[PDB]
Design an enzyme around this catalytic site. Sequence first.
Site, PDB file in Angstrom:
ATOM      1  N   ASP A   1       7.546  -2.097   8.210  1.00 17.64           N
ATOM      2  CA  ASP A   1       6.362  -2.861   8.568  1.00 17.64           C
ATOM      3  C   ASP A   1       6.661  -4.275   9.046  1.00 17.64           C
ATOM      4  O   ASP A   1       5.859  -5.199   8.846  1.00 17.64           O
ATOM      5  CB  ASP A   1       5.400  -2.904   7.384  1.00 17.64           C
ATOM      6  CG  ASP A   1       3.957  -3.159   7.803  1.00 17.64           C
ATOM      7  OD1 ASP A   1       3.582  -2.926   8.987  1.00 17.64           O
ATOM      8  OD2 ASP A   1       3.181  -3.589   6.921  1.00 17.64           O
TER       9      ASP A   1
ATOM     10  N   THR B   1      -3.478  -8.343  -3.395  1.00 21.49           N
ATOM     11  CA  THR B   1      -3.919  -9.701  -3.083  1.00 21.49           C
ATOM     12  C   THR B   1      -2.839 -10.688  -3.471  1.00 21.49           C
ATOM     13  O   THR B   1      -2.243 -10.550  -4.532  1.00 21.49           O
ATOM     14  CB  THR B   1      -5.192 -10.057  -3.855  1.00 21.49           C
ATOM     15  OG1 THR B   1      -6.011  -8.890  -3.995  1.00 21.49           O
ATOM     16  CG2 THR B   1      -5.961 -11.152  -3.138  1.00 21.49           C
TER      17      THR B   1
END
Lengths: 264, 234
Positions: A129, A23
């Site tokens: 990514d 997070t």
Amino acid sequence: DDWEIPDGQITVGQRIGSGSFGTVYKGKWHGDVAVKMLNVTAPTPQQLQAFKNEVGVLRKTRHVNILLFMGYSTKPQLAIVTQWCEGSSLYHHLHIIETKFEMIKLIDIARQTAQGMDYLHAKSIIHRDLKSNNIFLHEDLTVKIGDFGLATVKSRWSGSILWMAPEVIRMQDKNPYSFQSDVYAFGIVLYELMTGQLPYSNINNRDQIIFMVGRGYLSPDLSKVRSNCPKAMKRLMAECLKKKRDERPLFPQILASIELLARS
Amino acid sequence: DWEIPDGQITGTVYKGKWHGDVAVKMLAFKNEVGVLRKTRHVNILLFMGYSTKPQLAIVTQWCEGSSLYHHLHIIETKFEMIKLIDIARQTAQGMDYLHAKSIIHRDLKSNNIFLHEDLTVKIGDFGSGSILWMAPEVIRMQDKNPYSFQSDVYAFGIVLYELMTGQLPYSNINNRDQIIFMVGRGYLSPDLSKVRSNCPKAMKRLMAECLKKKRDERPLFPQILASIELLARS
Ligand SMILES: CN(C)S(=O)(=O)Nc1ccc(F)c(Nc2ncccc2-c2ncnc3nc[nH]c23)c1F
Ligand SMILES: CN(C)S(=O)(=O)Nc1ccc(F)c(Nc2ncccc2-c2ncnc3nc[nH]c23)c1F
């Protein structure tokens, strides 16, 4: 080597971005910063070491087009601290709020992204990514590439398939990632930049997108690009998107291509 | 069906005359010619027909001039850099074509590159004594099939060395068999510090990419071509 930030120093403000991997919050440490907290509950000494090795790789980067690593924390939670960019991702601009970029700026986004990627590649780092979600646009309009840390660690301890080249998509090889897989993803980012939209919108089954790209039956429809896109770029894009891995250009090439047409 | 009957033309090649000057190669096979008809490019040696009366033979144009090998080493011509670059692009133009047509050259070297009117390049001999141009996988013929598009890319790289050095690689090692062993295991590569001052990083850097030891890391020809074009416009 100690870029370790003692806990207490970092105030953790509002949350900005979740995801199983970790997070992200806006915090304070010598000013604005981004703090990414990992969801690893209780890392072992080994897990702690893998993490520091992976950080080791983060400290190999110092470039304006790479989001600036500033530190890490070990307790009470594993975290990566980076610079704070006032702005939004490329994914937000393009698909959430539909920002209209003049062609000159689009190409400039492309130049700066390729610059940073060439840099990562110069240092032998593979992103694994690259997606418009990890490209941030500063208020200046400097681009920062992010979320290339922790490649190894992410694996050991999902919504990037539009950017996966076929070899990647069909896990046949143990390690299907390479520079040219990054380059493919970058091509997809070109597609987003110049169509203003994501690939494969008219197909609704993920499992089937996975099958078809993976076998070369499905590729992005390049005729969708905007009419005022330079021919040289439609071409470059096409070449980045080659289904066969060994046919895709490396980043020094890509960068020169984009900087030549940035004069017309 | 493209045969050419006897008494109309005139081992090593001899010079002939059929519909103007021709080069005639003097040596089941009929399957090959089917592909050569459609092999049509400015920088590839033009195929005009075959023969088998007397022995089986291939005919192409005769182009006036001499091989890149001949120019660089035997008579040692001092070209301009702009020319060498020009030459290297043209060599890419053809190889690019030949791969587009699924043809692995299998034996690219400077003696297989001709300068027509000292200007335009023509590739040939794609229908050992040439280790200098062989890639490593090739140099240790190790399995079913070592050749590949990439194998050709390695050999084109050696020619780039030839172009800018003006000399053959490993010119300081006299044992051929050792050179074989050495390039095989990855211990010896060409000395890139021998290029002339005025070759742009790019050319020297392209050369490096071409000569990479691992097969799969070498660029394919469209990119080599697109790279030289990019470096061309400087
Ligand atoms: C070392 N980093 C560059 S990274 O590759 O490990 N990734 C990374 C690590 C920690 C982070 F805090 C961030 N930053 C963000 N990650 C996900 C979403 C948003 C951010 C983010 N970072 C900085 N400024 C932002 N402004 C909006 N979102 C921002 C990262 F991208
Ligand atoms: C498609 N053909 C080029 S080939 O691959 O089958 N090879 C070939 C077959 C017959 C040939 F005559 C040639 N050309 C030559 N081969 C050996 C020596 C010289 C030549 C040659 N060809 C054309 N013009 C020339 N001028 C001097 N030598 C020349 C060839 F390159």
